[PDB]
Amino acid sequence: PYWAYSGAYGPEHWVTSSVSCGGSHQSPIDILDHHARVGDEYQELQLDGFDNESSNKTWMKNTGKTVAILLKDDYFVSGAGLPGRFKAEKVEFHWGHSNGSAGSEHSVNGRRFPVEMQIFFYNPDDFDSFQTAISENRIIGAMAIFFQVSPRDNSALDPIIHGLKGVVHHEKETFLDPFILRDLLPASLGSYYRYTGSLTTPPCSEIVEWIVFRRPVPISYHQLEAFYSIFTTESVEYLRNNFRPQQALNDRVVSKS
Numbered sequence: 001p002y003w004a005y006s007g008a009y010g011p012e013h014w015v016t017s018s019v020s021c022g023g024s025h026q027s028p029i030d031i032l033d034h035h036a037r038v039g040d041e042y043q044e045l046q047l048d049g050f051d052n053e054s055s056n057k058t059w060m061k062n063t064g065k066t067v068a069i070l071l072k073d074d075y076f077v078s079g080a081g082l083p084g085r086f087k088a089e090k091v092e093f094h095w096g097h098s099n100g101s102a103g104s105e106h107s108v109n110g111r112r113f114p115v116e117m118q119i120f121f122y123n124p125d126d127f128d129s130f131q132t133a134i135s136e137n138r139i140i141g142a143m144a145i146f147f148q149v150s151p152r153d154n155s156a157l158d159p160i161i162h163g164l165k166g167v168v169h170h171e172k173e174t175f176l177d178p179f180i181l182r183d184l185l186p187a188s189l190g191s192y193y194r195y196t197g198s199l200t201t202p203p204c205s206e207i208v209e210w211i212v213f214r215r216p217v218p219i220s221y222h223q224l225e226a227f228y229s230i231f232t233t234e235s236v237e238y239l240r241n242n243f244r245p246q247q248a249l250n251d252r253v254v255s256k257s
Contacts, residue, residue: 031212067230106146123141158177198247200243
């Protein structure tokens with residue numbers, strides 16, 4: 001079904017075509033640190049493959065709703081109270097409008113960030129692929145990483161930024177220079193929140209175990225410009241403010257590592 005981030009098919013209307021979009025365990029949310037539970041004693045968050053440089057096969061696409069990176073190498077995450085070892089499928093981005101304006105989907109203590117990067121995972125021991133996991137409505141994993149402005153370019157982002165400059169128009173695709181996925185994550189890996197929620201776009205399936213890192217990754221204002229310069233096709237407009245409104249926590253509790 002068709003959907004958008006504004007207008008007649010904007011987020012307030014998604015439920016018309018996608019019933020789950022009106023569920024009670026939806027994402028994203030505001031995380032209030034003082035309402036979060038401490039002491040859950042999760043197993044160490046373990047990353048497998050994140051220090052390897054990515055393959056020249058990895059590519060990026062302007063989908064018109066976001067820019068997505070299709071990961072062609074094997075990256076795995078486990079621990080942190082995830083039900084199993086999850087394999088990375090793709091990375092998507094959400095950002096604001098100009099000059100570092102709020103773009104993240106999640107927030108912490110009411111604070112939003114200029115970009116949120118999300119990495120989506122599936123359990124390869126249950127399914128051959130991410131698409132099948134989704135369609136079967138089984139548990140998928142997702143990490144959310146915030147970016148925060150810094151006076152100098154973050155060199156770890158150079159391949160991603162260069163990629164954005166190659167997918168300015170809707171449907172454009174490009175291969176990416178090698179990047180190190182670990183370096184797109186916060187230096188402080190042990191500091192995160194966990195909650196159960198949903199995909200943040202239709203079908204909004206309530207099957208996502210979220211990891212939201214507490215600390216942001218630096219990006220320069222100049223680097224942010226590469227995000228703001230992306231187009232989408234409604235007529236051509238800039239692809240900006242591509243984030244879902246926050247959703248009610250309801251009976252859920254967020255856990256703090």
